[PDB]
Design a protein around this nucleic acid. Structure first.
Ligand code: MG
Ligand code: ZN
Lengths: 101, 51, 1340, 455, 50
DNA sequence: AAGAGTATGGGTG
DNA sequence: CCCATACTCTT
């Protein structure tokens, strides 16, 4: 007997990371960020933990911020948000300005 | 079950980079042997190549 | 004289031979078998009674108490067949068996009756057979296929010298019981007999003889003949029988009475034997050398010494003769053996046999049976006793005993079920006689040696298998002493019996889902014979011989209809008139010929009986009074056919369709088709899909009505009467007065089946074929089922076809189809699919079926009702929600972020998650039915209540329909009584009927009668109220679901499939093809009147296939359409009824001495007009499979319709208007749409899911799998030398995990380059080999 | 994992559990110093359990499950037709593949196949994603994925652009030789069936009555170039087994070419002198001349010189209208005698072989396509059909049968007189019937093959 | 003595069924042996290269 | 004391 | 069905 492979949220996120024009450093940062995402779609660790997990001192926090901002626009929109306010604002930023309220 | 045919202490983690009890969970703790459950913090695919 | 159904549309018959025997009911083999299994038998030979009498009485070891069986009974089923199919349960009946526990005292004569207790106990559920010969198991119809196996008894065979390299045959015999161990005897190249038990180690043949308490002298007496030498004081004077010297040569001077009849060196001839017999020559002087090697019969002793002179079965010598000569012995016994005949085999078997006693033979038998254990006298004796002489372990059944006795030329047919010494001795003697040269071996494939076993016998066997286990358990539990309070109910458990019955009826190899493509499929499935199954053969080890057509198959097994492939010759079809014996052997009917006159007497003969007579063919001319016209008739006598005289004929065939099966009898002009294409056509005819509208063949054989009616797919009137109510869903018949029972309301109600899914995901729909107020009779068809048209089988459509090539679009069996065919929906089919949603119970809480899902939008919930279930009639596609369900996910810990989420977006979102049922991707249709199953004790939702109300309405309607008639009759009686005395006339009808009850008459009998009528009215109302309450209780009953299951919801979707290129079409003659192109109407070839054809077929496919029946069918269909066109033209311009009936009478009277006679002078004008209306699209025609129409009759019918005799016309090209250079055959053919649709075939995959272990793509369209690249494709790529293609196929497309991702990324980036790695299956292989303790590793 | 929370078990895990239980019991018994009569039995059972784990059934009995089925061991995983080697290593299932029913494409060229676009959309999905991202229609991978899921109008243009020159592999099972897989250029079609060239079916042993084929997509540049240069059907003209052509016409093409190259004694337009094949075609299409009429036509033919130069010669030839019409398809370099006859299957095969040996590969492919087109067209134009009157029975059949029956009767009476043995009579009867059958066959074939015409 | 245009009777058709079924069974069976033969031939000459 | 023949078990389909 | 090995009769 044998089952079949199933695609989870992290598998889909890594599939999107693979087909994104990242650099090697950005790809490692994205790998760590996706590793730090739970099944509800929220980031579980502060960016300091990710920066420490990268393992080199040549990288600043703003690069991690840029990679996180790029990742947060993946499908589904709002994934890897820091908190509820961040997720709501990310979802709103994808709406057209013609929205009434 | 511990010391059984699917033991995580012998064959490896059932989740990526998470020990069985749950003290160490992320990539910053890679290569760490937990002193409580004895499970290494590594990939869960090592269960395909550990006898 | 014709029935009402047949008089609406009479089919013209071209048969010429009268029928003396009707086609029997086509499902008798199932119904009779199950009735025999289930019915009450005063004797104990069949059914449950036989099984009960074979186990009971059950007696304990001590004998102080015992159990006895008195009788059994079957209760009424809880639900009906339709109710069981709706609820998905099994249609069965309870078994109530009466047992009696008797207690015996001690120290008393015989057995004293201390106490007797009788109790009726429950033995489980037994599935019942429906009226159509099916079983409903878990709400699905199932068929149990009959088995063709080897009959019990003794059979003699011989390997044809293949085992040994000297080309010598070895005769053997085999004894096979119905239940027990096999017993084999065999010869060897040394002419030594040997015995095998249960196919085990070979043993000498005398072991069994000694085990039967026999001595060497007795064995020699049995198997040899005695010769007596007398010592008459002079050189052993001998009494000679001349027959002893036949075939021999004299080794000495044979003289008698002074005359030397035979000299030295002269062989004994027949003349010498005759002279000796005439002269009664007895005394013969023989030399001592004549006894140099003779075998001594018995043991001899010396009176003086008192020792044994010699032992039995020993060669003699001169010294032994001297010893016996001086010991005062005058009689010597020897055995008579030679080389040509009476060969010594038993003596040599004794010589090789090491045993010389009786106790050691049992020891050796025990050692052979069970090695590796010390032998025990008692154990060996019990083993031998129970091997073949115990009724509890060995059974030679009635058929087995009959065959055993018949094979040994016995006279008694009946006997015992166990072997005896006489049986084994006779088998040995018969085998010896076969070896000597007198007698013949048996034919295993002869149908007199093969037997039929049906569902009832198998059910009886399984029931006994359960019953013996129950008896063993009871005997185990009866040893303990508690009889003063024990009861039979507590002693037995009904679990093993029910488990065995369920296993047999649900998971047996011969129990299968019924083939439900069309009525012909079901008929064929119910008449199937299998050589496989438990106790049969296997396809891997069958052999050529068992797959061949045997001469005894004639009339019993169809020689045409058999699957092509591995199972060829192993699956068979019953013939039309075939039956079974009481022993289970196939028999056929014949007409008896008495003194050269063929009579109407019918005799059913089996294969053994048939070979002893000369039987004439059914194609033999006869006079008016029944005399053969010729004097040299063709007949079959002993497996061969030749000419015989008129007075040598004993029997004649009853019909020309006696040899074929039901499916083969439906092929017109079968005698003009090759057998291979006939087999293909018969196989393909039963996989046609019903279309939207049925169409009768218009060229048939006459077997359509029988198949349509005997299948049970139609509604048939149980009693005659008038159509009181007709509707698209129900029919109500007002029964005739003389067919009614006393005290009933004479109405019959038929509820029709509407758009129901079948086992093959097709549509089952019934439509009425009667009008309001018309008379009906018992047996008439009231409504047509699928593939039925006015009570006739209708599997396809009539197509206008031409035979010509058309620009390569009919190349290699391709089919060109007109667009008008598609526009008229002539091959459009309905397909119904089922989906299920199950709500279970979890530890976190039960799952809820609801319409409130928090994570989906309002638009996606628009098609769900208030209960979360889709509406009836909604159009859905892939991804749509059918049933909304949520699964609990609550936790007892609330984090601040969780509290914020619950506060802002509600608590329902944080507690449950979506687990709804959605339409699978690539599926579409319309919701036509929803069913809800709820466990008993759980509250019902709105949808279930609506369904139950709809169910209650119909029962209320039927009960009201009966009550109306009954109360109208009663009130008519009341009014009649009121009129006779105290009549009010108009005032009586001014008041309603209830006010008639509020009246009184004189003190005479009038008031008493009125009171009686009122009491009857009250009783009738009470009875109908009780009936309605019982129906409501049955409807509202809860469901018995699987453990942990709360609710189930089933949704049905209906879709319509149109014809398209890639679909498979076929005729009835083995002419199959695939549609290649749909052609616009103005591109098709057309005739002088501008009429195009529907189909274009390649004429190149006819000559090499030799299926000429399609051309004749096309010509005859052209003629039939011409007659129909004449009738239609006559109808369009209103003409007199006289002209119409004159032309129709001319059409029916055509032919060359046809048996059919139609007279329209007994038809009314309305009936004539109705018949003409039903004939305006072509006159249907019947041609039996060997009594059909000739070419001259076809040409005459073409002439009647003003059509060319050749059957060919001129056509014009649609695209250019130019005439084709040669005439083209144009006509009508019956075409079928098969169940190989290109919608179910096309599949493609880019990437998807993989196996967990091998990491390779899955297989199958349902799994969205990939195609397999096997070894032969690898060989092809190697032969090309395409190494990179092979490597790419091997690594980055199947199981190189990183290579797959890298290749996908590179392809997206526009860089077509791979980075191959190691396949994962090789690593799995390395790990598996290491797990075996072997060190295998990669190096450098 | 099964529905309801049940986890069931596997054979390997069951065997491991049995071994572990036996080992633990034996350890406990040896620790407590149990009597030897028990420990010997425990050791024997442990040996049996290890044997069952390693190779179940090889030693004596086999341990079975609930349904009386023997459990699978490691050896069962390794060996057999269902083992690793034959099921996962020598062959496997692959991505980028499909299958469906095959129909005939009479309009296709030899290097082309007909592919449904519903299959092609799934087969070429990552190529379409890359092409969508390349020209700015999609900015991210999810945008292209959603655009393809919606099946917008531009994705069809993208698909037509990405499959322009990209061979695919068609395979029919069983693959008996290397001609069972061939490469073709796809043409996007509507419907759900694959269209196949009529001239390749003989190589596939395929017919259009239910057969299905599988399709595979090469990915890398090396695979595509191997498909174009090694496996293209235009390269597989000759047979690797014997060197003979395998794309020879059959059936309808042969029938049409045979019909158009026959002559009739007195046909319309007979006896006129024509200026060339074009005048013959004009006369035939106008209805002024018959296809079978015997005429004289001016023909120019080319022959290769000693150094390989085509030299022309012109002359008047006695031929028919149909042969002159067919001559317009023959390439330069072949003699006119190759068509001036009634062309059967063997003649057409010889013509193709001559063209290949004299001129090369490309003219042979063009010639084969033209031959197929002309054969189909004229087979359609002929109107050839089959009727019951075409099967003409000889009028002497019954007389021959009666003579044979009389001989059988007289020899049977002679045998009944006791003059011959049984086997001799049987052989004589068989010989008589064989002779009668030969006579009937000769009479029927003599009647069938000739007809009477008015001069 | 009959052809397919004029038609066969019951006995002649029953006689022809023997050969029909024998041919069909032989065709159904021989492929399994042909596959084994070609497998062995491929096994014996797998590695022969110019 | 070897040598040829027979019975049994393994493998394939 | 075909081949390899242990056991039995014969020169
Ligand atoms: Mg085919
Ligand atoms: Zn831990």
């Amino acid at each position: 007997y044998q089952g079949e492979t199933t695609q989870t949220l992290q598998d889909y996120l890594m599939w999107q990371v693979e087909l994104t024009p990242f650099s090697d450093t950005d790809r490692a940062i994205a790998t760590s960020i996706v590793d730090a995402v739970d099944e509800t779609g929220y980031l579980t660790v502060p960016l300091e933990d990710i920066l420490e997990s990268i393992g080199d001192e040549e990288i600043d926090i703003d690069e991690v911020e840029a990679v996180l901002k790029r990742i947060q626009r993946f499908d589904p929109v709002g994934v890897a948000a820091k908190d509820l306010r961040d997720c709501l604002l990310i979802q709103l930023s994808q709406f057209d300005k013609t929205t009434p309220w | 079950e511990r010391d059984g045919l699917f033991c995580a202490r012998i064959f490896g983690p059932v989740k990526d980079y998470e020990c069985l009890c749950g003290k160490y969970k992320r990539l910053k703790h890679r290569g760490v042997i937990c002193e409580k459950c004895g499970v290494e913090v590594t990939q869960t695919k090592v269960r395909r190549e550990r006898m | 004289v014709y029935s009402y159904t047949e008089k609406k549309r009479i089919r013209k018959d071209f048969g010429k031979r009268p029928q003396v025997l009707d086609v029997p009911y086509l499902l008798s083999i199932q119904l009779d078998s199950f009735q025999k299994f289930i019915e009450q038998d005063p004797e104990g030979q069949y059914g449950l009674e036989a099984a009960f009498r074979s186990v009971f009485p059950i007696q304990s070891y001590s004998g102080n108490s015992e159990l006895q069986y008195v009788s059994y009974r079957l209760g009424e089923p809880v639900f009906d067949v339709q109710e069981c199919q709706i609820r998905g349960v099994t249609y069965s009946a309870p078994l109530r068996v009466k047992l009696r526990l008797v207690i015996y005292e001690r120290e008393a004569p015989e057995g004293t009756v201390k106490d007797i207790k009788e109790q009726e106990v429950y033995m489980g559920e037994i599935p019942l057979m429906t009226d159509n010969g099916t079983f409903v198991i878990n709400g699905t119809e199932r068929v149990i296929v009959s088995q063709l196996h080897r009959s019990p008894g003794v059979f003699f065979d011989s390997d044809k010298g293949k085992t040994h390299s000297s080309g010598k045959v070895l005769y053997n015999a085999r004894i096979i019981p119905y239940r027990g161990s096999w017993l084999d005897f065999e010869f060897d190249p040394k002419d030594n007999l040997f015995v095998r038990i249960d196919r085990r180690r070979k043993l000498p043949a005398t072991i069994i003889l000694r085990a039967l308490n026999y001595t060497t002298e007795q064995i020699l007496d049995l198997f040899f003949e005695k010769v007596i030498f007398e010592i008459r004081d002079n050189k052993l004077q001998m009494e000679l029988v001349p027959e002893r010297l036949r075939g021999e040569t004299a080794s000495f001077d044979i003289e008698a009475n002074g005359k030397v009849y035979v000299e030295k060196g002269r062989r004994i001839t027949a003349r010498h034997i005759r002279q000796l017999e005439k002269d009664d020559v007895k005394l013969i002087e023989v030399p001592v050398e004549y006894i140099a090697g003779k075998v001594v019969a018995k043991d001899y002793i010396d009176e003086s010494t008192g020792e044994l002179i010699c032992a039995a079965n020993m060669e003699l010598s001169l010294d032994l003769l001297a010893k016996l000569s001086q010991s005062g012995h005058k009689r010597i016994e020897t055995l008579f053996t030679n080389d040509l005949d009476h060969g010594p085999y038993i003596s040599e078997t004794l010589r090789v046999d090491p045993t010389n006693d009786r106790l050691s033979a049992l020891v050796e038998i025990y050692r052979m049976m069970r090695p590796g254990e010390p032998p025990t006298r008692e154990a060996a004796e019990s083993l031998f006793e129970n091997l073949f002489f115990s009724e509890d372990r060995y059974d030679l059944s009635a058929v087995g005993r009959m065959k055993f006795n018949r094979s040994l030329l016995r006279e008694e047919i009946e006997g015992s079920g166990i072997l005896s010494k006489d049986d084994i001795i006779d088998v040995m003697k018969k085998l010896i006689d076969i070896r000597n040269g007198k007698g013949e071996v048996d034919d295993i494939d002869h149908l007199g040696n093969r037997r039929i076993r049906s569902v009832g016998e198998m059910a009886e066997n399984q029931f006994r298998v359960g019953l013996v286990r129950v008896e063993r358990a009871v005997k185990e539990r009866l040893s303990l002493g508690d009889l003063d309070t024990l009861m039979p109910q507590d002693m037995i458990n009904a679990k093993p019996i029910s488990a065995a019955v369920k296993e047999f009826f649900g998971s047996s190899q011969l129990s299968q889902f019924m083939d439900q493509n069309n009525p012909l499929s079901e008929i064929t499935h119910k008449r199937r014979i299998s050589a496989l199954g438990p106790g049969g053969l296997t396809r891997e080890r069958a052999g050529f011989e068992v797959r061949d057509v045997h001469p005894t198959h004639y009339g019993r097994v169809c020689p045409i209809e058999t699957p092509e492939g591995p199972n060829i010759g192993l699956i068979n079809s019953l013939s039309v008139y075939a039956q079974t014996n009481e022993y289970g052997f196939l028999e056929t009917p014949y007409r008896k010929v008495t003194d050269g006159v063929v009579t109407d007497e019918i005799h059913y003969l089996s294969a053994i009986e048939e070979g002893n007579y000369v039987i004439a063919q059914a194609n033999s001319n006869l006079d008016e009074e029944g005399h053969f016209v010729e004097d040299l008739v063709t007949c079959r006598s002993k497996g061969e056919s030749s000419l015989f005289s008129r007075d040598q004929v004993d029997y004649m065939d009853v019909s020309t369709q006696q040899v074929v099966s039901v499916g083969a009898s439906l092929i017109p002009f079968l005698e003009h088709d090759d057998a291979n294409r006939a087999l293909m056509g018969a196989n393909m005819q039963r996989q046609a899909v019903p279309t939207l509208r049925a169409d009768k063949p218009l060229v048939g054989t006459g077997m359509e009505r029988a198949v349509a009616v005997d299948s049970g797919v139609t509604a048939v009137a149980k009693r005659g009467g008038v159509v009181q109510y007709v509707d698209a869903s129900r029919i109500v018949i007002k029964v005739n007065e003389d067919e009614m029972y006393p005290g009933e309301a004479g109405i019959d109600i038929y509820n029709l089946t509407k758009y129901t899914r079948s086992n093959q995901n097709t549509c089952i729909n019934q439509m009425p074929c009667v009008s309001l107020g018309e008379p009906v009779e018992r047996g008439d068809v009231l409504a047509d089922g699928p593939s039925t048209d006015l009570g006739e089988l209708a599997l396809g459509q009539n197509m206008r076809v031409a035979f010509m090539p058309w620009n390569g679009y009919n190349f290699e069996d391709s089919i060109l189809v007109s667009e008008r065919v598609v526009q008229e929906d002539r091959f459009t089919t309905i397909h119904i699919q089922e989906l299920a949603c199950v709500s279970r119970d979890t530890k976190l809480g039960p799952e809820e079926i609801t319409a409130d899902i928090p994570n989906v939008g309002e638009a996606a919930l628009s098609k769900l009702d208030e209960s979360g279930i889709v509406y009836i009639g909604a159009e859905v596609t892939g991804g749509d929600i059918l049933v909304g369900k949520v699964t609990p996910k609550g936790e007892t810990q609330l984090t601040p972020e969780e509290k914020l989420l619950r506060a802002i977006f509600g608590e329902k979102a944080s507690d449950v998650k979506d687990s709804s049922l959605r339409v699978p991707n690539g599926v579409s249709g319309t919701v036509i039915d929803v069913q809800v199953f709820t466990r008993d004790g759980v509250e019902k939702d709105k949808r279930a209540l609506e369904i139950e109300e709809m169910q209650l309405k119909q029962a209320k309607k039927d009960l009201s329909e009966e009550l109306q008639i009954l109360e109208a009759g009663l009130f008519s009686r009341i009014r009649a009584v009121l009129v006779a005395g105290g009549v009010e006339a108009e005032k009586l009808d001014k008041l309603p009927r209830d006010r008639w009850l509020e009246l009184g008459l004189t003190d005479e009998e009038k008031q008493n009668q009125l009171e009686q009528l009122a009491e009857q009215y009250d009783e009738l109302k009470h009875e109908f109220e009780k009936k309605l309450e019982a129906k409501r209780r049955k409807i509202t009953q809860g469901d018995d679901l699987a453990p942990g299951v709360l609710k189930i919801v089933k949704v049905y979707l209906a879709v319509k499939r149109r014809i398209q290129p890639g679909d498979k079409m076929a005729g009835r003659h083995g002419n199959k093809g695939v549609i290649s192109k749909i052609n616009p109407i103005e591109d098709m070839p057309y005739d002088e009147n501008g009429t195009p054809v529907d189909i274009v077929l390649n004429p190149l496919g006819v000559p090499s296939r030799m299926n000429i029946g399609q051309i004749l069918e096309t010509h005859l269909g052209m003629a039939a359409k011409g007659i129909g066109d004449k009738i239609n033209a006559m109808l369009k311009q209103q003409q007199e009824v006289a002209k119409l009936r004159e032309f129709i009478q001319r059409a029916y009277d055509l032919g060359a001495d046809v048996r059919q006679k139609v007279d329209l002078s007994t038809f009314s004008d309305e009936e004539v007009m109705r018949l003409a209306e039903n004939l305006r699209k072509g006159m249907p025609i019947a041609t039996p499979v060997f009594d059909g129409a000739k070419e001259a009759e076809i040409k005459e019918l073409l002439k009647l319709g003003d059509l060319p005799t050749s059957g060919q016309i001129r056509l014009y090209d649609g695209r250019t208007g130019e005439q084709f250079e040669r005439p083209v055959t144009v006509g009508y053919m019956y075409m079928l749409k098969l169940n190989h649709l290109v919608d179910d075939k096309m599949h493609a995959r880019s990437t998807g899911s993989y196996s967990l272990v091998t990491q390779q793509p899955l297989g199958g369209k349902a799994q969205f799998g990939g195609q397999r690249f096997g070894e032969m494709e690898v060989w092809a790529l190697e032969a090309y030398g395409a190494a990179y293609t092979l490597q790419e196929m091997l690594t980055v497309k199947s199981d190189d995990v990183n290579g797959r991702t890298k290749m996908y990324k590179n392809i997206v980036d526009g860089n077509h380059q791979m980075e191959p790695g190691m396949p994962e299956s090789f690593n799995v292989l390395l790990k598996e080999i290491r797990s075996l303790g072997i060190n295998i590793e990669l190096e450098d | 994992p099964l529905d309801g929370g049940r986890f069931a078990t596997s054979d390997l895990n069951d065997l491991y559990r049995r071994v572990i239980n036996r080992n633990n019991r034996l350890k406990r018994l040896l620790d407590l110093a149990a009597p030897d009569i028990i420990v010997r039995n425990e050791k024997r059972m442990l040996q049996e359990a290890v044997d069952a784990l390693l190779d179940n059934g090889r030693r004596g009995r086999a341990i079975t499950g609930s349904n009386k089925r023997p459990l699978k061991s490691l050896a069962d995983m390794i060996k057999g037709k269902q083992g690793r080697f034959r099921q996962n290593l020598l062959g496997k299932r692959v991505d980028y593949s499909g299958r469906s029913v095959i129909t005939v494409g009479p309009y296709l060229r030899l290097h082309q196949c007909g592919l449904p676009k519903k299959m092609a959309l799934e087969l070429f999905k990552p190529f379409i994603y890359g092409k969508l991202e390349l020209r700015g229609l999609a900015t991210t991978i999810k945008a292209a994925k959603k655009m393809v899921e919606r099946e917008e109008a531009v994705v069809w243009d993208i698909l037509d652009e990405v499959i322009r020159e990209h061979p695919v592999l068609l395979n029919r099972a069983p693959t008996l030789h290397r001609l069972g897989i061939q490469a073709f250029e796809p043409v996007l079609i509507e419907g759900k069936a694959i269209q196949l060239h009529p001239l390749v079916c003989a190589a596939y042993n395929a017919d259009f009555d239910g057969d299905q084929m599988a399709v595979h997509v090469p990915l890398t540049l090396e695979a595509q170039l191997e498909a174009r240069a090694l496996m293209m059907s235009t390269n597989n003209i000759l047979s690797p087994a014997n060197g003979e052509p395998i794309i020879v016409p059959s059936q309808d093409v042969v029938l049409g070419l045979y019909y158009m190259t026959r002559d009739c004694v007195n046909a319309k337009g007979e006896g006129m002198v024509l200026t060339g094949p074009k005048e013959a075609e004009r006369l035939y299409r106008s209805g002024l001349a018959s296809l079978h009429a015997r005429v004289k036509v001016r023909i120019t033919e080319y022959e290769k010189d000693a150094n390989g130069e085509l030299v022309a010669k012109t002359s008047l030839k006695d031929t028919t209208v149909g042969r002159a019409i067919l001559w317009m398809i023959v390439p330069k370099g072949l003699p006119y005698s190759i068509v001036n006859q009634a062309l059967g299957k063997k003649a057409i095969s010889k013509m193709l072989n001559t063209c290949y040996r004299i001129l090369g590969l490309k003219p042979t492919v063009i010639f084969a396509d033209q031959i197929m087109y002309t054969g189909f067209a004229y087979a359609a134009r002929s109107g050839a059909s089959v009727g019951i009157d075409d099967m003409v029975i000889p009028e002497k059949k019954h007389e021959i049968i009666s003579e044979a029956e009389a001989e059988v009767a007289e020899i049977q009476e002679q045998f009944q007189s006791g003059l011959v043995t049984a086997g001799e009579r049987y052989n004589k009867v068989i010989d008589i019937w064989a002779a009668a059958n030969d006579r009937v066959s000769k009479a029927m074939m003599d009647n069938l093959q000739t007809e009477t015409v008015i001069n | 003595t009959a052809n397919f245009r004029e038609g066969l009777n019951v006995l002649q058709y029953f006689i022809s069924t023997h050969g029909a079924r024998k041919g069909l069974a032989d065709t159904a069976l021989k492929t399994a042996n042909s596959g084994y033969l070609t497998r062995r031939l491929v096994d014996v000459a797998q590695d022969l290269v110019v």
